[PDB]
Subunit: 225 residues, 3 copies
């Protein structure tokens, strides 16, 4: 039921992240414009990082227990480490894409940081009632992140090239929905409520990752710079 | 006596940090000069960060036990996390204020890092005698920080505008004293000696925070840039 | 046998790092060119950081136990913290030396990060078989680091000054060998296999550190900039 029934979704997850990394490694070896290089650096780190964090969830070093609700619950603090580094790089990705000010960057990054850090604390709190208090705060940092993301990576992501507002209206819809999913998924699943089995939650989070991870990598890279 | 008698000073602390954040959020929404924006980004992160870290001290996730001296002691490792991120942002604040070299910045930041990191280790060591060895080292990193702060955020904080040396002679006296307080307070209180009840120590650290946090935020922001 | 027979190599290690820091502190106090300052900032942080991490290994706060193989093993997670910060600064050192692109930097840094972070996880895994899986991955991140280091801090470290390719052909051979040693040493010693006593491993790692730490500091600094 825990650290058992889902290794399949976790094993498949490692496979995907890793071939995903292998892919970006043997498809970025060239690169000319220092700029483009930066974008490739980023798109590789994410998969590689998310790669190892998923291998620790598979092997079991990144799965702990947490007393809450009345019994012992499985919490993959390994996930939290994953996003704890991916989300900011990825965020730096989008930012540098529509070239933003170091002010909205430091804002965003650190903001994202209160989001994930706070979320992690939530995920480890032992008294039920509280888990959701943190769920709420982390959310707020994410609704703020996303806010800047939307109203911004639209406007400040328009006054430029021809396709700018186009490709951009894509990336947004996709990042916005994609992201707001983690908040929900978390909530309904094991690490929060108990409306979704850990068995399903993982599969959900995995589709969730692989997409955000590579998916967003590709789409992102495809947006020239 | 522990994680009990002081919730009042901790509850009041959360209130203050948070309304403090709410304040900077709904008073920075405008901003023009990318520069000014950076300063607002910073002044908000601090309260927000210090906000959540104080809510974890309130709720109890950020309060642990440490065997030293002969009995079990309460240590809010949550404080250490707080300053572990605030102090460097805040430091980046002052630095960018009198526009310094990336050399004195990386120096300062990392220096501050040996200060807090080392301090944290101190706060968690179990053998009495040692606690103070770390107290000493962390201090040294802080006397070095402050050193650059004083002899610098005076000189290198003078050859510019008219009020420069003025406002600046303010900020200094205030940061210097304010800071050197944490070293002392720590020392006389529970997490170190036993000359001050945890009951009082908290109130002291709280006045201490709220001031450093917002106080320094305002004063800081008020210094144009 | 553990946290006992080697304090000598650890005590000598603290001495060396610290006088090493004292040295860079009272030999960098001047400095003119903001640039040179940055290089001095870096060379000091390393010793100072590595200083405190070695004092925690000496005093015993940075030495833990890990069930693997069949019995309890001593693991100085304190080492891992050490390199966890040194290696990236040091890396930033070499990078800025042959002035590289922010792309190869972010790449390198983060890469180094998967190396050390991953290594650390290895060092703490309880099931024998696995330890070496992580040993393998961390290695891969290091063979990639070093790769860029060699084929790069040669070419991209040539088309410049007269001595460039010279001094540079030095620094390389020295960093390359020096580094690849930590991977091997780790492997044959206590924290991995059992072909080397913890008694010897420490002495090895210490010579290893002091050299990388100061040695590389000097050599590095001596390369003007
Ligand atoms: C590669 C991973 C990505 C892009 C992850 C994004 C994750 C989030 C936006 C997570 C958000 C969460 C909350 C808003 C509430 C608490 C639970 C979290 C951490 C899943
Ligand atoms: C918002 C928080 C701020 C500005 C905190 C500043 C804190 C310090 C300068 C703390 C210094 C300490 C020492 C010098 C010795 C060990 C105890 C500490 C960590 C309280
Ligand atoms: C001052 C310390 C320095 C320059 C340390 C460098 C360390 C490494 C390159 C360590 C590498 C390791 C592996 C490749 C495999 C796992 C064991 C490690 C962490 C020792």
């Amino acid at each position: 039921i825990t650290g058992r029934p889902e290794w399949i979704w976790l094993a498949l997850g490692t496979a995907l992240m890793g071939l995903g990394t292998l892919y970006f490694l043997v498809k970025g070896m060239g690169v000319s414009d220092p700029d483009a290089k930066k974008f490739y650096a980023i798109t590789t780190l994410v998969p590689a990082i998310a790669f190892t964090m998923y291998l620790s969830m598979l092997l079991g070093y990144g799965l702990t227990m947490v007393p809450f609700g009345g019994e012992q619950n499985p919490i993959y603090w390994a996930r939290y480490a994953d996003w704890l580094f991916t989300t900011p790089l990825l965020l730096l990705g989008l930012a540098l894409l529509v070239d933003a000010d170091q002010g909205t960057i430091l804002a965003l990054v650190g903001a994202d940081g209160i989001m994930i850090g706070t979320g992690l604390v939530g995920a480890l709190t032992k008294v039920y009632s509280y888990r959701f208090v943190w769920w709420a705060i982390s959310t707020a940092a994410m609704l703020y992140i996303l806010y800047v993301l939307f109203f911004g990576f639209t406007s400040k992501a328009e006054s430029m090239r021809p396709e700018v507002a186009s490709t951009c209206k894509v990336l947004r819809n996709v990042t916005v929905v994609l992201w707001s999913a983690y908040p929900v998924v978390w909530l309904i699943g094991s690490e929060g409520a108990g409306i979704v089995p850990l068995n399903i939650e993982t599969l959900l989070f995995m589709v969730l990752d692989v997409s955000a991870k590579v998916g967003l990598g590709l789409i992102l890279l495809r947006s020239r710079a």
